[PDB]
Amino acid sequence: KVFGRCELAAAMKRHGLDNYRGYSLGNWVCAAKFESNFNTQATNRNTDGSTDYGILQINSRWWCNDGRTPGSRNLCNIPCSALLSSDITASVNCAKKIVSDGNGMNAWVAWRNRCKGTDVQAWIRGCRL
């Protein structure tokens, strides 16, 4: 599935991301935008053998198990394939664990590069939330 900006915003709200660990909804939408372009199916292969999965490009070395990643930790306790659903639940559940880990949203490179310090509220303006 490719989410629309406002559709995603509403899903993320319903899943309790608004202000989670001090990050307003706009942060999350912004991250999704630069990470996956709002695509639930996005995958990216890395030099270390790991793959980033789904709308929040969650990495197979630390977070989910794809069975082909050396040094896997599976800290979210999920198969990576569950991160490619049309339903964002799994991804949100894992993301809540990631952000609670100590580096906040610095875990998302695209967030750090492109969202942090900007008017992230732009991402939710025009939406019926």
PDB file of C-alpha atoms in Angstrom:
ATOM      1  CA  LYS A   1       0.000   0.000   0.000  1.00  0.00           C
ATOM      2  CA  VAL A   2       1.054   3.613  -0.666  1.00  0.00           C
ATOM      3  CA  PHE A   3      -0.457   5.815   2.050  1.00  0.00           C
ATOM      4  CA  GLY A   4      -1.640   9.340   1.398  1.00  0.00           C
ATOM      5  CA  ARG A   5      -0.093  11.936   3.729  1.00  0.00           C
ATOM      6  CA  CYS A   6      -3.351  12.613   5.588  1.00  0.00           C
ATOM      7  CA  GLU A   7      -4.401   8.980   5.629  1.00  0.00           C
ATOM      8  CA  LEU A   8      -1.086   8.033   7.287  1.00  0.00           C
ATOM      9  CA  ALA A   9      -1.330  10.898   9.784  1.00  0.00           C
ATOM     10  CA  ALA A  10      -4.758   9.553  10.895  1.00  0.00           C
ATOM     11  CA  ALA A  11      -3.439   5.968  11.186  1.00  0.00           C
ATOM     12  CA  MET A  12      -0.445   7.099  13.263  1.00  0.00           C
ATOM     13  CA  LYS A  13      -2.721   9.176  15.546  1.00  0.00           C
ATOM     14  CA  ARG A  14      -4.992   6.172  16.162  1.00  0.00           C
ATOM     15  CA  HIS A  15      -1.927   4.087  17.015  1.00  0.00           C
ATOM     16  CA  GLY A  16      -0.800   6.535  19.725  1.00  0.00           C
ATOM     17  CA  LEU A  17       2.233   8.088  18.010  1.00  0.00           C
ATOM     18  CA  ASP A  18       1.143  11.675  18.657  1.00  0.00           C
ATOM     19  CA  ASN A  19       3.640  13.008  21.235  1.00  0.00           C
ATOM     20  CA  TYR A  20       5.062   9.507  21.884  1.00  0.00           C
ATOM     21  CA  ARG A  21       8.301   9.873  23.816  1.00  0.00           C
ATOM     22  CA  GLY A  22       7.962  13.601  23.222  1.00  0.00           C
ATOM     23  CA  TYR A  23       7.663  13.523  19.419  1.00  0.00           C
ATOM     24  CA  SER A  24       4.657  15.176  17.795  1.00  0.00           C
ATOM     25  CA  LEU A  25       2.743  13.409  15.039  1.00  0.00           C
ATOM     26  CA  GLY A  26       4.415  15.535  12.351  1.00  0.00           C
ATOM     27  CA  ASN A  27       7.768  13.978  13.249  1.00  0.00           C
ATOM     28  CA  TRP A  28       6.458  10.486  12.444  1.00  0.00           C
ATOM     29  CA  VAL A  29       4.799  11.475   9.158  1.00  0.00           C
ATOM     30  CA  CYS A  30       7.945  13.309   8.105  1.00  0.00           C
ATOM     31  CA  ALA A  31      10.060  10.244   8.916  1.00  0.00           C
ATOM     32  CA  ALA A  32       7.740   7.944   6.886  1.00  0.00           C
ATOM     33  CA  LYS A  33       7.946  10.389   3.958  1.00  0.00           C
ATOM     34  CA  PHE A  34      11.743  10.423   3.668  1.00  0.00           C
ATOM     35  CA  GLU A  35      12.182   6.807   4.712  1.00  0.00           C
ATOM     36  CA  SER A  36       9.760   5.007   2.395  1.00  0.00           C
ATOM     37  CA  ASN A  37       7.771   7.683   0.568  1.00  0.00           C
ATOM     38  CA  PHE A  38       4.741   6.320   2.459  1.00  0.00           C
ATOM     39  CA  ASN A  39       5.205   2.821   0.990  1.00  0.00           C
ATOM     40  CA  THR A  40       4.410  -0.175   3.178  1.00  0.00           C
ATOM     41  CA  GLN A  41       6.334  -2.452   0.791  1.00  0.00           C
ATOM     42  CA  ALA A  42       9.657  -0.599   0.637  1.00  0.00           C
ATOM     43  CA  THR A  43      12.792  -2.676   1.228  1.00  0.00           C
ATOM     44  CA  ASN A  44      16.445  -1.579   1.035  1.00  0.00           C
ATOM     45  CA  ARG A  45      19.485  -3.866   1.180  1.00  0.00           C
ATOM     46  CA  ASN A  46      22.581  -2.697   3.060  1.00  0.00           C
ATOM     47  CA  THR A  47      26.316  -3.418   2.879  1.00  0.00           C
ATOM     48  CA  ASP A  48      26.221  -5.310   6.216  1.00  0.00           C
ATOM     49  CA  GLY A  49      23.735  -7.953   4.939  1.00  0.00           C
ATOM     50  CA  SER A  50      20.756  -6.305   6.662  1.00  0.00           C
ATOM     51  CA  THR A  51      17.566  -5.083   5.011  1.00  0.00           C
ATOM     52  CA  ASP A  52      15.342  -2.163   6.034  1.00  0.00           C
ATOM     53  CA  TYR A  53      11.656  -3.059   5.983  1.00  0.00           C
ATOM     54  CA  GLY A  54       8.416  -1.177   5.399  1.00  0.00           C
ATOM     55  CA  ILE A  55       6.998   2.246   6.021  1.00  0.00           C
ATOM     56  CA  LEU A  56       9.546   3.076   8.714  1.00  0.00           C
ATOM     57  CA  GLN A  57      12.433   1.120   7.157  1.00  0.00           C
ATOM     58  CA  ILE A  58      13.134  -0.939  10.279  1.00  0.00           C
ATOM     59  CA  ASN A  59      16.470  -2.729  10.123  1.00  0.00           C
ATOM     60  CA  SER A  60      17.005  -6.500  10.213  1.00  0.00           C
ATOM     61  CA  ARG A  61      20.272  -6.433  12.203  1.00  0.00           C
ATOM     62  CA  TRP A  62      18.711  -5.148  15.457  1.00  0.00           C
ATOM     63  CA  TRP A  63      14.941  -5.179  15.160  1.00  0.00           C
ATOM     64  CA  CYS A  64      13.212  -7.959  13.251  1.00  0.00           C
ATOM     65  CA  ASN A  65      14.223 -11.417  12.062  1.00  0.00           C
ATOM     66  CA  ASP A  66      14.499 -12.140   8.346  1.00  0.00           C
ATOM     67  CA  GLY A  67      16.687 -15.220   8.774  1.00  0.00           C
ATOM     68  CA  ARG A  68      19.435 -14.018   6.409  1.00  0.00           C
ATOM     69  CA  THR A  69      21.082 -11.326   8.505  1.00  0.00           C
ATOM     70  CA  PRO A  70      24.318 -12.157  10.310  1.00  0.00           C
ATOM     71  CA  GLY A  71      24.331 -10.921  13.936  1.00  0.00           C
ATOM     72  CA  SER A  72      20.551 -10.423  14.116  1.00  0.00           C
ATOM     73  CA  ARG A  73      19.117  -9.389  17.510  1.00  0.00           C
ATOM     74  CA  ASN A  74      15.345  -9.363  16.874  1.00  0.00           C
ATOM     75  CA  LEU A  75      14.696  -6.801  19.631  1.00  0.00           C
ATOM     76  CA  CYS A  76      11.105  -6.241  18.446  1.00  0.00           C
ATOM     77  CA  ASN A  77      10.480 -10.004  18.485  1.00  0.00           C
ATOM     78  CA  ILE A  78       8.875 -10.054  15.018  1.00  0.00           C
ATOM     79  CA  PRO A  79       9.484 -11.476  11.571  1.00  0.00           C
ATOM     80  CA  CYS A  80      10.549  -8.707   9.191  1.00  0.00           C
ATOM     81  CA  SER A  81       7.785  -9.873   6.783  1.00  0.00           C
ATOM     82  CA  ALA A  82       5.212  -8.572   9.316  1.00  0.00           C
ATOM     83  CA  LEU A  83       6.621  -5.071   8.672  1.00  0.00           C
ATOM     84  CA  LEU A  84       5.477  -5.229   5.035  1.00  0.00           C
ATOM     85  CA  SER A  85       1.751  -5.396   5.857  1.00  0.00           C
ATOM     86  CA  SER A  86      -0.808  -2.889   4.598  1.00  0.00           C
ATOM     87  CA  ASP A  87      -1.708  -2.506   8.276  1.00  0.00           C
ATOM     88  CA  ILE A  88       0.883  -0.356  10.077  1.00  0.00           C
ATOM     89  CA  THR A  89       0.315  -1.892  13.541  1.00  0.00           C
ATOM     90  CA  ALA A  90       3.425  -4.099  13.609  1.00  0.00           C
ATOM     91  CA  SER A  91       5.636  -1.277  12.359  1.00  0.00           C
ATOM     92  CA  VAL A  92       4.221   1.202  14.918  1.00  0.00           C
ATOM     93  CA  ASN A  93       4.692  -1.369  17.731  1.00  0.00           C
ATOM     94  CA  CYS A  94       8.299  -1.888  16.783  1.00  0.00           C
ATOM     95  CA  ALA A  95       8.903   1.857  16.324  1.00  0.00           C
ATOM     96  CA  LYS A  96       7.691   2.508  19.889  1.00  0.00           C
ATOM     97  CA  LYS A  97      10.375   0.082  21.089  1.00  0.00           C
ATOM     98  CA  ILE A  98      13.083   1.710  18.956  1.00  0.00           C
ATOM     99  CA  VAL A  99      12.381   5.250  20.144  1.00  0.00           C
ATOM    100  CA  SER A 100      12.335   4.156  23.759  1.00  0.00           C
ATOM    101  CA  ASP A 101      15.888   2.787  23.314  1.00  0.00           C
ATOM    102  CA  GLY A 102      17.827   5.984  24.076  1.00  0.00           C
ATOM    103  CA  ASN A 103      18.491   7.879  20.848  1.00  0.00           C
ATOM    104  CA  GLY A 104      14.888   9.024  20.295  1.00  0.00           C
ATOM    105  CA  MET A 105      14.148   9.415  16.558  1.00  0.00           C
ATOM    106  CA  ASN A 106      17.862   9.591  15.730  1.00  0.00           C
ATOM    107  CA  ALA A 107      17.361   5.908  14.876  1.00  0.00           C
ATOM    108  CA  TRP A 108      15.850   7.085  11.573  1.00  0.00           C
ATOM    109  CA  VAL A 109      18.546   8.623   9.370  1.00  0.00           C
ATOM    110  CA  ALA A 110      16.009  10.310   7.086  1.00  0.00           C
ATOM    111  CA  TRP A 111      14.400  11.888  10.157  1.00  0.00           C
ATOM    112  CA  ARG A 112      17.737  13.246  11.394  1.00  0.00           C
ATOM    113  CA  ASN A 113      18.703  14.540   7.926  1.00  0.00           C
ATOM    114  CA  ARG A 114      15.378  15.908   6.734  1.00  0.00           C
ATOM    115  CA  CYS A 115      12.879  16.310   9.555  1.00  0.00           C
ATOM    116  CA  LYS A 116      14.649  17.331  12.749  1.00  0.00           C
ATOM    117  CA  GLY A 117      14.579  21.079  13.318  1.00  0.00           C
ATOM    118  CA  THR A 118      12.008  21.807  10.595  1.00  0.00           C
ATOM    119  CA  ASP A 119       8.359  22.758  10.791  1.00  0.00           C
ATOM    120  CA  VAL A 120       7.104  19.176  11.041  1.00  0.00           C
ATOM    121  CA  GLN A 121       3.583  20.487  11.609  1.00  0.00           C
ATOM    122  CA  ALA A 122       3.535  21.117   7.806  1.00  0.00           C
ATOM    123  CA  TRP A 123       3.089  17.340   7.498  1.00  0.00           C
ATOM    124  CA  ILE A 124      -0.300  17.368   9.228  1.00  0.00           C
ATOM    125  CA  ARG A 125      -1.744  20.708   8.079  1.00  0.00           C
ATOM    126  CA  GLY A 126      -4.765  20.274   5.830  1.00  0.00           C
ATOM    127  CA  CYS A 127      -5.710  16.944   7.423  1.00  0.00           C
ATOM    128  CA  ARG A 128      -8.921  16.124   9.300  1.00  0.00           C
ATOM    129  CA  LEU A 129      -7.374  14.585  12.412  1.00  0.00           C
TER     130      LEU A 129
END
